[PDB]
Amino acid sequence: LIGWVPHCDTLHALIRDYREKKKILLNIEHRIMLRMAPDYDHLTLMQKVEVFEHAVNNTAGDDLAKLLWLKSPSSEVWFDRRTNYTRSLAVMSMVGYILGLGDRHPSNLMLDRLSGKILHIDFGDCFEVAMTREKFPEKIPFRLTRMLTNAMEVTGL
Amino acid sequence: IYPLTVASKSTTTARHNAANKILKNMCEHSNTLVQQAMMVSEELIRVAILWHEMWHEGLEEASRLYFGERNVKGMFEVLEPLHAMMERGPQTLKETSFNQAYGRDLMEAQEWCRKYMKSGNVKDLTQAWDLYYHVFRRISKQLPQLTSLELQYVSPKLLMCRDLELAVPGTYDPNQPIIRIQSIAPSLQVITSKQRPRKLTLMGSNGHEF
Amino acid sequence: NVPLDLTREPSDNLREILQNVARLQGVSNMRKLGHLNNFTKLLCDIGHSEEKLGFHYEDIIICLRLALLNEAKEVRAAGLRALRYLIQDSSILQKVLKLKVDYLIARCIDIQQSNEVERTQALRLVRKMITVNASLFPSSVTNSLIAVGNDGLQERDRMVRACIAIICELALQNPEVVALRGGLNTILKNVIDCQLSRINEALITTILHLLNHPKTRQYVRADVELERILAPYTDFHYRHSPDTAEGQLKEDREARFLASKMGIIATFRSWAGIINLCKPGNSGIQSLIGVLCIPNMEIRRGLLEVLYDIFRLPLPVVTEEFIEALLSVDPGRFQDSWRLSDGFVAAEAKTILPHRARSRPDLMDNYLALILSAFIRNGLLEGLVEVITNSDDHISVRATILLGELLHMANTILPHSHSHHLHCLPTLMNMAASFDIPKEKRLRASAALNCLKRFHEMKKRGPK
Amino acid sequence: AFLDNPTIILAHIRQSHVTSDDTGMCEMVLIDHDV
Amino acid sequence: TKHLRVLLRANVEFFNNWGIELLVTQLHDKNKTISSEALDILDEACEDKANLHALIQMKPALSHLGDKGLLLLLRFLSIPKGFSYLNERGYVAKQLEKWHREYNSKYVDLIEEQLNEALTTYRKPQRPHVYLPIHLYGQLVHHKTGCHLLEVQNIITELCRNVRTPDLDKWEEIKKLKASLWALGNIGSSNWGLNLLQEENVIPDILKLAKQCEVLSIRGTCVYVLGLIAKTKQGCDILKCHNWDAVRHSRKHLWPVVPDYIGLALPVDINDIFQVKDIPYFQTKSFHLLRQQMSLTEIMNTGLQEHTDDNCLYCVCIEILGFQPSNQMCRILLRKEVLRLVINLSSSVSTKCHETGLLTIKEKYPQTFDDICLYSEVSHLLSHCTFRLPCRRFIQELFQDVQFLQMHEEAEAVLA
Ligand SMILES: [Zn+2]
């Protein structure tokens, strides 16, 4: 029995609503990679970098940055929420790294609407279990992508 | 009260006997508290997984063991608890409904599995899986249709409480006054997902819904 | 072929039996077809004997056995026809079964190669085998008929009902073989997806017959066989067929309700079904009544139609006002048979003027008295009260009329003892004119009594 | 109803099927000659 | 003819002197349907004593009609004036013999036919009315003189012993029990019919049979016959002692009020009839291992398991007929592979994988499906196991293009 946290929505659904409103396909990045190389999953390590790097250059990742500002009634509230988001994602990055959290896909990442905080769920894969599996072994300590790093502040991370 | 109830329901005999010994000691000073907790715990787990939910997971796991792992003794041990709960009789209309649509096929398939343990012919076990797979297809076609549950249909005992001295789960501290469970909503919603979680809304003693 | 009918019986027999083998060389299929017809005509002349028709029975079966293996459906059809005229007594049937001819008879049942003439001859042989000796029916033929009936609709087989009618006949003289092969399950599953009034009545009657005699109830389980027909109403999400098209999914549910409704009515008019569905312990009638109280609109609108047909009450029209529905149930409503073209006054006076008999027992009243008492014992009245005050506007009116009809039916057909707890409605008094309960629910119960009050006036007036 | 003895059950089975079959098969396979 | 019924139900003045006589002439009408309708409305008119007395003084000829006329003629025995007229030419004695051998049991058929026509959707070649047909024993006990004949013949003893000793095994002797329950029920419909019926203590025997009976049809039959006993105040008192209440009012007033009876009675507790004793269910009373560990080609780089000399198409004829023994390691390894795929096809788990494995064998080795013994083994397996219809038709279709020369060669020699 898990309690229900109010005023929070997952990251995957938050981005999905923004793109469909702007008449933008949900999987534009994925479609570009398949268009350039249909057998993307079977490519070698060096070839997947070429396809992945090309996709992120033709699409500018700023959906999350504009999403937060459009949901802020005033600029004073907008700055306060952004500050909380920046320092709440950093705490879970180091704490999660020690715990060895994995499988941090957007469906397991929730952002508080009222306060801008970041909440993690589905603490199933811990202690570097996901890194040693034979099926797609992820080799990153925590999730820090271009979408997240472009919303904390303009100067970067 | 909550951790002990989980221990008392464990399959291990050592944990089961030890947990009950502590529980009966608590019945001296507070007997009505443990009785309500046992009733709530048994009903909540019943709502979480229904009879057709258990069979869908049990048959899928058993099929992988028999055809993938080529294990026969490991297949029977999975299906034994599933057939055991149906021999105690339904306790609600939902269980009664399941015992009518799929009652004959499951009970007959057990008979063929019983003949395999004695005769040893492979054909008896193969004929048993003809009934198991037929039910599995029927159940799999109605799982997506499940999107809402009524308390009267699944568990009549939950909506007939109207008062409890057991505190709301997950909120209890010695430095704060205790808040008890007042009532349970008559309807709960099932979230469309692979695990299909349920949304249960309680009612606190202070008028705040949890 | 030229029928000789001149030489001796052994001489006429040799040509046809020597031409059935032919080593598949030197003889055409046309000659074999003609010779087989000669054998049937010859058998009608000389009686069944091993002394006049040359060789013994066993030799004849051996050569006749080499006729169902032909690649021409015309030759196989004639071979099956010859067997029916040969099998007369149990001695011959046991000899045919000895040579394992059933392996080939069951083969011709399911080939589905545009040979409906061949398949008809095979099934006609089966009915002959059952009549001669039903206690030695082969298990190979039985398993073929079950398969063609259990899964005979998905393959668009046209001879599906012709095989179910044979399983029921076999289930009355040899239930042991049918029970082992799961033949009783096939009949139960057929009534679920059979919406023909006369056929559905016959299929359910066969199963109820096995529950009548004490020595035949051992072939039917306790609470899972007969209660299968209650699944569409008891289960809110019922899937009869694991594999079906999703185009008519909505229409499939309506078809199941219509077919299941006739099954429930059929099993409530037989003593072997009334008792089994109204057992003192856990029974199907309590589940049927219990599911009525659940606030489901689709089930409630279906169960009410079942109750009207069980008691044989005229259905009112769908509306949200009681007055319009009340006028549609009056006994003096006009009918087409009352016109001048039809019975002018004779037809009308029959349904208006009362019968001139005050002491002749009416056996139909006795049947309704027992059925009505069974539902009251299980709590039909309590269930109706919940429906009236907790359902839709057009559903409460139908339940209000049904409750009023039962009260009128029960004050003149039930005895004194059953009337002490009859006109009380303990659950209705709980939801009375009180401010404790919600105000909206308070007036619905009060308005229901006001609406039900006017029903008394209609019966007081009588037909006019 | 008193559909108890097999004498009337057999008649009911072989009459409803023949009368109420859309496909002309029960009219040809349920011939009373074969008894 | 149909318009004389409304005049009967409207209480037209003096209908019994000019309306009855017009229904007697109409009996001899040329059309059978018109005459049949006259009998239907004449039976309804006989419920009044004034109309019944009119028919007796007219003494019509109803013998030449069918069973409908016979039943209407038997109602004259309920009147002392009508009994004397009929029992003067020796008629009651003839009916007693007929109502004991020929159609005493046929009265059950009349009861069942009307109920079947009412609500069964049977139609032997809306709420209807099903009234009890006229019975000879039920009409002869209305007066003391008629009851005297029924006692000297000593028929009650014959019927009572048929109830205390029922044989619920043969369907032909069960109907004899029904033929006695309806006979005893009609006797108990009158006060003078109960005096000689309760002296042998038979009513409790029926009550016991109405709640503890193996055959559920007999249990339901006793419900109706107990209603007939409740047609009198004396009869309803007996049933009340044994916890069987009954309606104590007629039908002429459909609005009973607390202070001739209609036939209806129910137990105080309805569950006392619906109890049935439980009866136990009748069911309660190799190469496969090596094949999965290797490959079909790997092994290559008697085979029939359930093959006995009693259930084979060719082998069973060696002794009875006189056939020759069948003649033939590379082939024995294909029989096992074919059989194991057929067995695995009975589970319907992976049909495509198993169907493909059989088509390849018939392609690479088309001659392996040409032995009669293998076909018998597969045919034998199709009987014990269960297969889907599309999968069952897949088998027995690989053997369609075969010759089976061995059976043809041996059958020709012995037959010639
Ligand atoms: Zn052989």
Numbering used by the authors:
A (entry chain A): 2236 to 2392
B (entry chain A): 1973 to 2182
C (entry chain E): 25 to 488
D (entry chain G): 2 to 36
E (entry chain E): 733 to 857, 872 to 1005, 1423 to 1448, 1479 to 1494, 1510 to 1536, 1607 to 1694
What does the paper say about this structure?
DEP domain-containing mTOR interacting protein (DEPTOR), conserved in vertebrates, modulates the activity of the serine/threonine kinase mammalian target of rapamycin (mTOR), a master regulator of cell growth. mTOR acts in two functionally distinct multiprotein complexes, mTOR complex 1 (mTORC1) and mTORC2, and DEPTOR is the only protein reported to bind and inhibit both mTOR complexes. DEPTOR is a 46 kDa protein comprising an N-terminal DEP (Dishevelled, Egl-10, and Pleckstrin) domain tandem, herein referred to as DEPt, and a C-terminal PDZ (postsynaptic density 95, disks large, zonula occludens-1) domain. Biochemical analysis and cryo-EM reconstructions of DEPTOR bound to human mTOR complex 1 (mTORC1) and mTORC2 reveal that both structured regions of DEPTOR, the PDZ domain and the DEP domain tandem (DEPt), are involved in mTOR interaction. The PDZ domain binds tightly with mildly activating effect, but then acts as an anchor for DEPt association that allosterically suppresses mTOR activation.
DEPTOR-mTORC2 overall refinement (map 1), focused refinement on symmetry-expanded protomer (map 2), and focused refinement on one protomer classified for the DEP domain tandem (DEPt) region (map 3) were used for modeling and illustration. (e) Fourier shell correlation (FSC) curves for unmasked, spherical, loose, and tight masks, and corrected FSC curve for the map 2 reconstruction, yielding a gold standard FSC resolution of 3.20 Å. The PDZ domain core (aaDEPTOR326–409) adopts a canonical PDZ fold and binds the TRD2 subdomain of the mTOR FAT domain. The interaction interface is formed by a conserved surface of the PDZ domain and three mTOR helices (aamTOR1525–1578). The canonical PDZ domain peptide binding groove is present, but remains unoccupied in the interaction of the DEPTOR PDZ domain with mTOR. In complex with DEPTOR, residues aamTOR304–317 are ordered and the backbone of residues aamTOR290–303 connecting to the Horn is visible at lower resolution. Residues aamTOR304–306 interact with the DEPTOR PDZ domain and residue FmTOR306 is inserted between the DEPTOR PDZ and mTOR FAT domains as an integral part of the interface. Residues aaDEPTOR309–325 provide an N-terminal extension to the PDZ core domain, while aaDEPTOR304–308 bind a groove formed by alpha-helices 14–16 of the mTOR FAT domain. The binding interface is well defined with a local resolution of around 3 Å. Local resolution for the PDZ domain decreases due to flexibility with increasing distance from the interface to around 4 Å.
